[PDB]
Amino acid sequence: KVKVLWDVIEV
């Protein structure tokens, strides 16, 4: 199955 992985960085 297909997933979108998401992340953030605080730069």
CB of 7 to a copy of itself, least distance (A): 4
Footprint on residues 1-11 left by a copy of itself (CB under 8 A): 1-11
Joined together, the tokens standing for residue 7 give 């992340």
CB of 4 to Na ion, least distance (A): 13
How many C-beta neighbours within 10 Å does residue 1 have?
2
| Number of chain residues interacting with a copy of itself (CB under 8 A) | 11
The site for a copy of itself (CB under 8 A) is made up of 1-11
